[PDB]
Amino acid sequence: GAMGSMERASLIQKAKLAEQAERYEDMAAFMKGAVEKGEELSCEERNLLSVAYKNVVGGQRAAWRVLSSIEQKSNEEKGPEVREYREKVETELQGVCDTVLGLLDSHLIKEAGDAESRVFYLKMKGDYYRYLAEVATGDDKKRIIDSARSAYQEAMDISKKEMPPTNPIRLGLALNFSVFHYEIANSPEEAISLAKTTFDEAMADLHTLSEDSYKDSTLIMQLLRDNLTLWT
Amino acid sequence: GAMGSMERASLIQKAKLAEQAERYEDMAAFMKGAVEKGEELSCEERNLLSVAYKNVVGGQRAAWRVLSSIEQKSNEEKGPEVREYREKVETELQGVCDTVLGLLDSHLIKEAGDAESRVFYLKMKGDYYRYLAEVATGDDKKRIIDSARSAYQEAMDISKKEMPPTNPIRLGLALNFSVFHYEIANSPEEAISLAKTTFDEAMADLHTLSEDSYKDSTLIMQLLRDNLTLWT
Amino acid sequence: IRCSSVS
Protein backbone atom coordinates (compact mmCIF):
# COMPACT_ATOMS: atom_id res chain seq x y z
CA GLY A 1 0.00 0.00 0.00
CA ALA A 2 2.72 2.49 -0.87
CA MET A 3 0.03 4.38 -2.83
CA GLY A 4 -2.42 4.53 0.09
CA SER A 5 -1.69 8.19 0.80
CA MET A 6 -2.25 9.43 -2.78
CA GLU A 7 -5.61 10.68 -4.05
CA ARG A 8 -7.46 8.36 -6.42
CA ALA A 9 -7.61 11.08 -9.09
CA SER A 10 -3.87 11.79 -8.77
CA LEU A 11 -3.09 8.07 -9.15
CA ILE A 12 -5.12 7.97 -12.38
CA GLN A 13 -3.50 11.16 -13.67
CA LYS A 14 -0.02 9.77 -12.96
CA ALA A 15 -0.88 6.44 -14.60
CA LYS A 16 -1.65 8.41 -17.77
CA LEU A 17 1.65 10.32 -17.46
CA ALA A 18 3.54 7.05 -16.95
CA GLU A 19 1.93 5.65 -20.10
CA GLN A 20 3.18 8.63 -22.11
CA ALA A 21 6.65 8.13 -20.61
CA GLU A 22 6.52 4.36 -21.34
CA ARG A 23 7.08 3.75 -17.61
CA TYR A 24 4.82 0.73 -17.36
CA GLU A 25 5.98 -0.54 -13.95
CA ASP A 26 5.09 2.88 -12.55
CA MET A 27 1.82 2.81 -14.48
CA ALA A 28 0.87 -0.54 -12.97
CA ALA A 29 1.75 0.56 -9.44
CA PHE A 30 -0.38 3.69 -9.85
CA MET A 31 -3.34 1.68 -11.19
CA LYS A 32 -2.97 -0.92 -8.43
CA GLY A 33 -3.15 1.97 -5.97
CA ALA A 34 -6.28 3.25 -7.69
CA VAL A 35 -7.94 -0.18 -7.52
CA GLU A 36 -7.11 -0.42 -3.82
CA LYS A 37 -9.17 2.71 -3.16
CA GLY A 38 -12.10 0.28 -3.30
CA GLU A 39 -14.29 2.10 -5.81
CA GLU A 40 -15.37 0.56 -9.09
CA LEU A 41 -13.34 1.47 -12.19
CA SER A 42 -14.63 3.33 -15.23
CA CYS A 43 -14.11 1.97 -18.75
CA GLU A 44 -11.09 4.22 -19.28
CA GLU A 45 -9.61 3.21 -15.92
CA ARG A 46 -10.10 -0.51 -16.63
CA ASN A 47 -8.17 -0.09 -19.86
CA LEU A 48 -5.36 1.78 -18.07
CA LEU A 49 -5.07 -1.10 -15.59
CA SER A 50 -4.94 -3.72 -18.34
CA VAL A 51 -2.50 -1.82 -20.56
CA ALA A 52 -0.13 -1.30 -17.63
CA TYR A 53 0.05 -4.92 -16.51
CA LYS A 54 0.01 -6.29 -20.07
CA ASN A 55 3.19 -4.33 -20.76
CA VAL A 56 4.83 -5.37 -17.48
CA VAL A 57 4.08 -9.07 -17.86
CA GLY A 58 4.83 -8.88 -21.59
CA GLY A 59 8.43 -7.90 -20.91
CA GLN A 60 8.73 -10.70 -18.36
CA ARG A 61 7.24 -13.28 -20.73
CA ALA A 62 9.59 -12.23 -23.51
CA ALA A 63 12.57 -12.52 -21.14
CA TRP A 64 11.35 -15.89 -19.87
CA ARG A 65 11.12 -17.22 -23.44
CA VAL A 66 14.66 -16.07 -24.24
CA LEU A 67 16.01 -17.71 -21.09
CA SER A 68 13.94 -20.88 -21.52
CA SER A 69 15.32 -21.36 -25.04
CA ILE A 70 18.89 -20.90 -23.80
CA GLU A 71 18.22 -23.34 -20.95
CA GLN A 72 16.86 -26.03 -23.29
CA LYS A 73 19.81 -25.74 -25.69
CA SER A 74 22.18 -25.95 -22.71
CA ASN A 75 20.49 -29.24 -21.71
CA GLU A 76 20.55 -30.73 -25.24
CA GLU A 77 27.41 -26.61 -21.30
CA LYS A 78 27.02 -26.87 -17.52
CA GLY A 79 26.40 -24.76 -14.44
CA PRO A 80 23.22 -23.79 -12.59
CA GLU A 81 23.23 -20.15 -13.70
CA VAL A 82 20.82 -20.31 -16.65
CA ARG A 83 18.26 -22.30 -14.66
CA GLU A 84 18.69 -19.99 -11.65
CA TYR A 85 18.15 -16.84 -13.68
CA ARG A 86 15.20 -18.33 -15.60
CA GLU A 87 13.64 -19.28 -12.24
CA LYS A 88 14.21 -15.73 -10.97
CA VAL A 89 12.39 -14.19 -13.94
CA GLU A 90 9.71 -16.89 -13.67
CA THR A 91 9.15 -16.12 -9.98
CA GLU A 92 8.85 -12.39 -10.71
CA LEU A 93 6.35 -13.09 -13.51
CA GLN A 94 4.27 -15.34 -11.25
CA GLY A 95 4.29 -12.60 -8.64
CA VAL A 96 2.87 -10.06 -11.08
CA CYS A 97 0.16 -12.50 -12.19
CA ASP A 98 -0.70 -13.20 -8.54
CA THR A 99 -0.95 -9.45 -7.95
CA VAL A 100 -3.37 -8.99 -10.85
CA LEU A 101 -5.44 -12.04 -9.92
CA GLY A 102 -5.55 -10.72 -6.37
CA LEU A 103 -6.94 -7.36 -7.51
CA LEU A 104 -9.59 -9.17 -9.54
CA ASP A 105 -10.54 -11.34 -6.57
CA SER A 106 -10.38 -8.45 -4.04
CA HIS A 107 -12.76 -7.19 -5.17
CA LEU A 108 -13.16 -6.10 -8.79
CA ILE A 109 -15.08 -9.09 -10.14
CA LYS A 110 -17.57 -9.44 -7.28
CA GLU A 111 -18.62 -5.78 -7.61
CA ALA A 112 -18.83 -5.82 -11.44
CA GLY A 113 -22.54 -6.00 -12.29
CA ASP A 114 -22.61 -4.60 -15.84
CA ALA A 115 -21.76 -6.82 -18.80
CA GLU A 116 -18.89 -4.66 -20.06
CA SER A 117 -17.09 -4.60 -16.70
CA ARG A 118 -17.75 -8.21 -15.72
CA VAL A 119 -16.62 -9.55 -19.11
CA PHE A 120 -13.51 -7.32 -19.04
CA TYR A 121 -12.41 -8.58 -15.62
CA LEU A 122 -13.19 -12.24 -16.36
CA LYS A 123 -11.14 -11.94 -19.56
CA MET A 124 -8.26 -10.52 -17.51
CA LYS A 125 -8.58 -13.41 -15.07
CA GLY A 126 -8.34 -15.87 -17.96
CA ASP A 127 -5.35 -13.97 -19.38
CA TYR A 128 -3.28 -13.96 -16.19
CA TYR A 129 -4.05 -17.62 -15.46
CA ARG A 130 -2.97 -18.24 -19.08
CA TYR A 131 0.35 -16.47 -18.41
CA LEU A 132 0.84 -18.64 -15.32
CA ALA A 133 0.06 -21.70 -17.45
CA GLU A 134 2.79 -20.79 -19.95
CA VAL A 135 5.43 -21.40 -17.23
CA ALA A 136 3.64 -24.04 -15.15
CA THR A 137 5.11 -27.53 -14.80
CA GLY A 138 4.24 -28.94 -11.36
CA ASP A 139 1.36 -30.27 -9.29
CA ASP A 140 -1.09 -27.50 -10.22
CA LYS A 141 -0.45 -27.08 -13.97
CA LYS A 142 -3.79 -28.65 -14.84
CA ARG A 143 -5.65 -26.67 -12.18
CA ILE A 144 -4.13 -23.45 -13.54
CA ILE A 145 -5.21 -24.31 -17.09
CA ASP A 146 -8.74 -25.01 -15.94
CA SER A 147 -8.87 -21.74 -13.97
CA ALA A 148 -8.05 -19.90 -17.19
CA ARG A 149 -10.57 -21.92 -19.20
CA SER A 150 -13.32 -21.42 -16.62
CA ALA A 151 -12.79 -17.65 -16.42
CA TYR A 152 -12.78 -17.34 -20.22
CA GLN A 153 -15.87 -19.55 -20.49
CA GLU A 154 -17.84 -17.48 -17.96
CA ALA A 155 -16.83 -14.32 -19.82
CA MET A 156 -17.89 -15.88 -23.14
CA ASP A 157 -21.28 -16.90 -21.73
CA ILE A 158 -22.03 -13.37 -20.51
CA SER A 159 -20.68 -11.76 -23.68
CA LYS A 160 -22.86 -13.86 -25.96
CA LYS A 161 -25.97 -12.95 -23.94
CA GLU A 162 -25.27 -9.27 -23.32
CA MET A 163 -23.05 -7.83 -26.07
CA PRO A 164 -23.20 -7.54 -29.86
CA PRO A 165 -20.74 -9.70 -31.81
CA THR A 166 -18.76 -6.59 -32.84
CA ASN A 167 -18.19 -5.38 -29.28
CA PRO A 168 -14.40 -4.93 -28.94
CA ILE A 169 -14.33 -6.51 -25.47
CA ARG A 170 -16.21 -9.55 -26.80
CA LEU A 171 -13.89 -9.71 -29.83
CA GLY A 172 -10.73 -9.47 -27.74
CA LEU A 173 -11.99 -12.09 -25.30
CA ALA A 174 -12.62 -14.48 -28.19
CA LEU A 175 -9.19 -13.73 -29.69
CA ASN A 176 -7.40 -14.46 -26.41
CA PHE A 177 -9.55 -17.50 -25.63
CA SER A 178 -8.65 -18.89 -29.06
CA VAL A 179 -4.95 -18.31 -28.27
CA PHE A 180 -5.53 -20.20 -25.01
CA HIS A 181 -6.97 -23.13 -26.96
CA TYR A 182 -4.09 -23.18 -29.46
CA GLU A 183 -1.11 -22.54 -27.18
CA ILE A 184 -2.17 -23.85 -23.75
CA ALA A 185 -4.91 -26.45 -24.11
CA ASN A 186 -3.35 -28.18 -27.17
CA SER A 187 -6.72 -27.71 -28.92
CA PRO A 188 -5.89 -26.14 -32.30
CA GLU A 189 -9.19 -27.15 -33.89
CA GLU A 190 -11.11 -25.42 -31.08
CA ALA A 191 -8.89 -22.35 -31.52
CA ILE A 192 -9.54 -22.18 -35.28
CA SER A 193 -13.28 -22.81 -34.91
CA LEU A 194 -13.64 -20.09 -32.30
CA ALA A 195 -11.62 -17.55 -34.31
CA LYS A 196 -13.59 -18.25 -37.50
CA THR A 197 -17.03 -18.17 -35.85
CA THR A 198 -16.11 -14.94 -34.03
CA PHE A 199 -14.85 -13.32 -37.23
CA ASP A 200 -17.89 -14.33 -39.30
CA GLU A 201 -20.48 -13.21 -36.73
CA ALA A 202 -18.68 -9.87 -36.35
CA MET A 203 -18.57 -9.37 -40.13
CA ALA A 204 -22.36 -9.75 -40.34
CA ASP A 205 -22.88 -7.10 -37.62
CA LEU A 206 -20.51 -4.43 -38.99
CA HIS A 207 -23.35 -2.77 -40.91
CA THR A 208 -24.80 -1.44 -37.63
CA LEU A 209 -21.66 0.42 -36.56
CA SER A 210 -20.59 4.03 -36.88
CA GLU A 211 -17.30 4.75 -38.61
CA ASP A 212 -15.41 4.98 -35.30
CA SER A 213 -16.89 1.72 -33.95
CA TYR A 214 -16.20 0.07 -37.32
CA LYS A 215 -12.51 0.94 -36.98
CA ASP A 216 -12.39 -0.41 -33.42
CA SER A 217 -14.02 -3.73 -34.32
CA THR A 218 -12.17 -4.36 -37.58
CA LEU A 219 -8.78 -3.82 -35.92
CA ILE A 220 -9.41 -6.82 -33.67
CA MET A 221 -10.97 -8.80 -36.53
CA GLN A 222 -7.67 -8.37 -38.38
CA LEU A 223 -5.87 -10.02 -35.45
CA LEU A 224 -8.30 -12.95 -35.62
CA ARG A 225 -7.53 -13.27 -39.33
CA ASP A 226 -3.77 -12.98 -38.69
CA ASN A 227 -3.97 -15.88 -36.23
CA LEU A 228 -6.07 -17.98 -38.62
CA THR A 229 -3.48 -17.37 -41.36
CA LEU A 230 -0.74 -18.57 -39.01
CA TRP A 231 -2.78 -21.62 -37.91
CA THR A 232 -4.15 -22.75 -41.29
CA GLY B 1 25.07 -6.05 -1.44
CA ALA B 2 22.28 -8.40 -2.46
CA MET B 3 24.80 -9.96 -4.88
CA GLY B 4 27.46 -10.53 -2.21
CA SER B 5 26.78 -14.26 -2.00
CA MET B 6 27.05 -14.95 -5.76
CA GLU B 7 30.29 -15.98 -7.46
CA ARG B 8 31.97 -13.32 -9.60
CA ALA B 9 31.89 -15.61 -12.65
CA SER B 10 28.18 -16.38 -12.14
CA LEU B 11 27.40 -12.65 -11.91
CA ILE B 12 29.17 -12.05 -15.23
CA GLN B 13 27.43 -15.03 -16.84
CA LYS B 14 24.02 -13.79 -15.67
CA ALA B 15 24.78 -10.24 -16.86
CA LYS B 16 25.28 -11.71 -20.34
CA LEU B 17 22.00 -13.67 -20.06
CA ALA B 18 20.19 -10.52 -18.93
CA GLU B 19 21.55 -8.66 -21.94
CA GLN B 20 20.13 -11.32 -24.27
CA ALA B 21 16.79 -11.06 -22.45
CA GLU B 22 16.88 -7.22 -22.61
CA ARG B 23 16.62 -7.18 -18.81
CA TYR B 24 18.91 -4.22 -18.29
CA GLU B 25 18.03 -3.47 -14.65
CA ASP B 26 19.00 -7.06 -13.84
CA MET B 27 22.12 -6.69 -15.99
CA ALA B 28 23.20 -3.59 -14.08
CA ALA B 29 22.59 -5.21 -10.70
CA PHE B 30 24.67 -8.23 -11.73
CA MET B 31 27.52 -6.03 -12.98
CA LYS B 32 27.38 -3.87 -9.84
CA GLY B 33 27.74 -7.09 -7.86
CA ALA B 34 30.72 -8.08 -10.00
CA VAL B 35 32.41 -4.71 -9.44
CA GLU B 36 31.86 -5.02 -5.70
CA LYS B 37 33.95 -8.21 -5.68
CA GLY B 38 36.88 -5.76 -5.68
CA GLU B 39 38.86 -7.18 -8.60
CA GLU B 40 39.69 -5.16 -11.68
CA LEU B 41 37.41 -5.61 -14.71
CA SER B 42 38.45 -6.99 -18.09
CA CYS B 43 37.66 -5.12 -21.32
CA GLU B 44 34.60 -7.29 -21.94
CA GLU B 45 33.40 -6.80 -18.36
CA ARG B 46 33.85 -3.01 -18.54
CA ASN B 47 31.67 -2.96 -21.64
CA LEU B 48 29.00 -5.09 -19.94
CA LEU B 49 28.92 -2.61 -17.04
CA SER B 50 28.59 0.39 -19.35
CA VAL B 51 25.98 -1.18 -21.63
CA ALA B 52 23.84 -2.14 -18.64
CA TYR B 53 23.77 1.27 -16.98
CA LYS B 54 23.54 3.15 -20.29
CA ASN B 55 20.30 1.31 -21.01
CA VAL B 56 18.92 1.83 -17.50
CA VAL B 57 19.67 5.55 -17.37
CA GLY B 58 18.62 5.92 -21.02
CA GLY B 59 15.09 4.82 -20.22
CA GLN B 60 15.00 7.21 -17.27
CA ARG B 61 16.32 10.12 -19.33
CA ALA B 62 13.75 9.49 -22.05
CA ALA B 63 10.97 9.40 -19.43
CA TRP B 64 12.30 12.55 -17.77
CA ARG B 65 12.26 14.40 -21.11
CA VAL B 66 8.66 13.36 -21.80
CA LEU B 67 7.58 14.51 -18.34
CA SER B 68 9.63 17.72 -18.46
CA SER B 69 7.97 18.71 -21.75
CA ILE B 70 4.51 18.05 -20.31
CA GLU B 71 5.41 20.04 -17.19
CA GLN B 72 6.60 23.05 -19.20
CA LYS B 73 3.47 23.11 -21.38
CA SER B 74 1.34 22.86 -18.23
CA ASN B 75 3.12 25.97 -16.89
CA GLU B 76 2.80 27.98 -20.14
CA GLU B 77 -3.76 23.27 -16.34
CA LYS B 78 -3.07 22.97 -12.60
CA GLY B 79 -2.23 20.42 -9.93
CA PRO B 80 1.08 19.21 -8.50
CA GLU B 81 0.96 15.77 -10.13
CA VAL B 82 3.14 16.39 -13.20
CA ARG B 83 5.85 18.07 -11.14
CA GLU B 84 5.65 15.34 -8.49
CA TYR B 85 6.01 12.53 -11.00
CA ARG B 86 8.81 14.31 -12.90
CA GLU B 87 10.63 14.76 -9.57
CA LYS B 88 10.15 11.05 -8.81
CA VAL B 89 11.72 9.98 -12.10
CA GLU B 90 14.43 12.63 -11.65
CA THR B 91 15.27 11.32 -8.16
CA GLU B 92 15.49 7.75 -9.46
CA LEU B 93 17.77 8.87 -12.31
CA GLN B 94 20.03 10.77 -9.91
CA GLY B 95 20.19 7.67 -7.74
CA VAL B 96 21.40 5.53 -10.64
CA CYS B 97 24.03 8.12 -11.58
CA ASP B 98 25.19 8.28 -7.95
CA THR B 99 25.46 4.48 -7.94
CA VAL B 100 27.64 4.47 -11.06
CA LEU B 101 29.80 7.36 -9.85
CA GLY B 102 30.17 5.53 -6.55
CA LEU B 103 31.45 2.39 -8.28
CA LEU B 104 33.95 4.49 -10.23
CA ASP B 105 35.14 6.20 -7.04
CA SER B 106 35.16 2.97 -4.98
CA HIS B 107 37.44 1.90 -6.46
CA LEU B 108 37.54 1.37 -10.22
CA ILE B 109 39.37 4.54 -11.25
CA LYS B 110 42.08 4.47 -8.58
CA GLU B 111 43.08 0.91 -9.53
CA ALA B 112 42.99 1.52 -13.32
CA GLY B 113 46.62 1.84 -14.42
CA ASP B 114 46.40 0.99 -18.13
CA ALA B 115 45.35 3.62 -20.65
CA GLU B 116 42.37 1.66 -21.99
CA SER B 117 40.83 1.08 -18.55
CA ARG B 118 41.59 4.52 -17.10
CA VAL B 119 40.21 6.33 -20.15
CA PHE B 120 37.10 4.10 -20.18
CA TYR B 121 36.28 4.83 -16.53
CA LEU B 122 37.02 8.57 -16.78
CA LYS B 123 34.73 8.73 -19.81
CA MET B 124 32.00 7.01 -17.78
CA LYS B 125 32.54 9.50 -14.96
CA GLY B 126 32.09 12.36 -17.43
CA ASP B 127 28.98 10.68 -18.88
CA TYR B 128 27.16 10.18 -15.58
CA TYR B 129 28.01 13.69 -14.37
CA ARG B 130 26.65 14.85 -17.76
CA TYR B 131 23.39 12.97 -17.10
CA LEU B 132 23.15 14.66 -13.70
CA ALA B 133 23.78 18.01 -15.40
CA GLU B 134 20.86 17.46 -17.79
CA VAL B 135 18.44 17.64 -14.81
CA ALA B 136 20.40 19.95 -12.51
CA THR B 137 18.99 23.35 -11.52
CA GLY B 138 20.13 24.23 -8.00
CA ASP B 139 23.17 25.25 -5.98
CA ASP B 140 25.53 22.66 -7.50
CA LYS B 141 24.60 22.81 -11.21
CA LYS B 142 27.86 24.51 -12.10
CA ARG B 143 29.91 22.17 -9.91
CA ILE B 144 28.27 19.17 -11.62
CA ILE B 145 29.08 20.57 -15.07
CA ASP B 146 32.69 21.11 -14.10
CA SER B 147 32.96 17.57 -12.66
CA ALA B 148 31.88 16.23 -16.05
CA ARG B 149 34.24 18.55 -17.93
CA SER B 150 37.19 17.68 -15.67
CA ALA B 151 36.65 13.92 -16.00
CA TYR B 152 36.34 14.18 -19.78
CA GLN B 153 39.41 16.42 -19.96
CA GLU B 154 41.57 14.02 -17.93
CA ALA B 155 40.39 11.16 -20.16
CA MET B 156 41.20 13.20 -23.28
CA ASP B 157 44.69 14.02 -22.00
CA ILE B 158 45.51 10.35 -21.38
CA SER B 159 43.91 9.22 -24.64
CA LYS B 160 45.92 11.66 -26.75
CA LYS B 161 49.17 10.48 -25.13
CA GLU B 162 48.50 6.73 -25.02
CA MET B 163 46.06 5.70 -27.77
CA PRO B 164 45.92 5.99 -31.56
CA PRO B 165 43.33 8.39 -32.97
CA THR B 166 41.26 5.47 -34.30
CA ASN B 167 40.95 3.73 -30.92
CA PRO B 168 37.20 3.22 -30.35
CA ILE B 169 37.42 4.26 -26.69
CA ARG B 170 39.20 7.48 -27.70
CA LEU B 171 36.65 8.08 -30.49
CA GLY B 172 33.66 7.50 -28.21
CA LEU B 173 35.12 9.74 -25.52
CA ALA B 174 35.54 12.54 -28.06
CA LEU B 175 32.00 12.00 -29.38
CA ASN B 176 30.47 12.22 -25.90
CA PHE B 177 32.70 15.13 -24.84
CA SER B 178 31.55 17.01 -27.95
CA VAL B 179 27.91 16.30 -26.96
CA PHE B 180 28.75 17.68 -23.51
CA HIS B 181 30.05 20.87 -25.11
CA TYR B 182 26.99 21.28 -27.35
CA GLU B 183 24.19 20.29 -24.97
CA ILE B 184 25.52 21.08 -21.47
CA ALA B 185 28.24 23.73 -21.65
CA ASN B 186 26.46 25.88 -24.28
CA SER B 187 29.68 25.70 -26.35
CA PRO B 188 28.58 24.64 -29.84
CA GLU B 189 31.76 25.89 -31.52
CA GLU B 190 33.88 23.78 -29.16
CA ALA B 191 31.61 20.79 -29.88
CA ILE B 192 31.96 21.19 -33.65
CA SER B 193 35.73 21.78 -33.49
CA LEU B 194 36.28 18.70 -31.35
CA ALA B 195 34.09 16.48 -33.55
CA LYS B 196 35.80 17.66 -36.75
CA THR B 197 39.36 17.36 -35.40
CA THR B 198 38.57 13.89 -34.02
CA PHE B 199 37.06 12.75 -37.32
CA ASP B 200 39.93 14.08 -39.44
CA GLU B 201 42.71 12.60 -37.28
CA ALA B 202 40.92 9.23 -37.26
CA MET B 203 40.51 9.29 -41.05
CA ALA B 204 44.28 9.73 -41.50
CA ASP B 205 44.99 6.70 -39.25
CA LEU B 206 42.51 4.25 -40.82
CA HIS B 207 45.18 2.92 -43.18
CA THR B 208 46.87 1.12 -40.25
CA LEU B 209 43.82 -0.89 -39.23
CA SER B 210 42.70 -4.42 -40.00
CA GLU B 211 39.28 -4.89 -41.56
CA ASP B 212 37.66 -5.63 -38.18
CA SER B 213 39.25 -2.60 -36.48
CA TYR B 214 38.32 -0.47 -39.50
CA LYS B 215 34.66 -1.40 -39.01
CA ASP B 216 34.82 -0.60 -35.29
CA SER B 217 36.40 2.83 -35.81
CA THR B 218 34.30 3.92 -38.79
CA LEU B 219 31.05 3.13 -36.96
CA ILE B 220 31.87 5.77 -34.35
CA MET B 221 33.21 8.16 -37.00
CA GLN B 222 29.78 7.99 -38.62
CA LEU B 223 28.22 9.17 -35.35
CA LEU B 224 30.65 12.10 -35.27
CA ARG B 225 29.59 12.97 -38.82
CA ASP B 226 25.90 12.57 -37.93
CA ASN B 227 26.30 15.07 -35.10
CA LEU B 228 28.22 17.52 -37.31
CA THR B 229 25.42 17.30 -39.89
CA LEU B 230 22.88 18.13 -37.19
CA TRP B 231 25.01 20.99 -35.81
CA THR B 232 26.12 22.62 -39.07
CA ILE C 1 5.39 -15.82 -35.86
CA ARG C 2 3.73 -15.71 -32.42
CA CYS C 3 -0.03 -15.46 -31.89
CA SER C 4 -1.69 -12.08 -31.51
CA SER C 5 -3.57 -11.25 -28.28
CA VAL C 6 -5.02 -8.04 -26.73
CA SER C 7 -5.33 -6.31 -23.35
Place this chain on the structure above:
Amino acid sequence: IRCSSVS
Protein backbone atom coordinates in the same frame (compact mmCIF):
# COMPACT_ATOMS: atom_id res chain seq x y z
CA ILE D 1 17.00 14.90 -34.01
CA ARG D 2 18.92 14.28 -30.76
CA CYS D 3 22.71 13.99 -30.58
CA SER D 4 24.37 10.60 -30.83
CA SER D 5 26.49 9.31 -27.92
CA VAL D 6 28.04 5.91 -26.98
CA SER D 7 28.60 3.70 -23.93
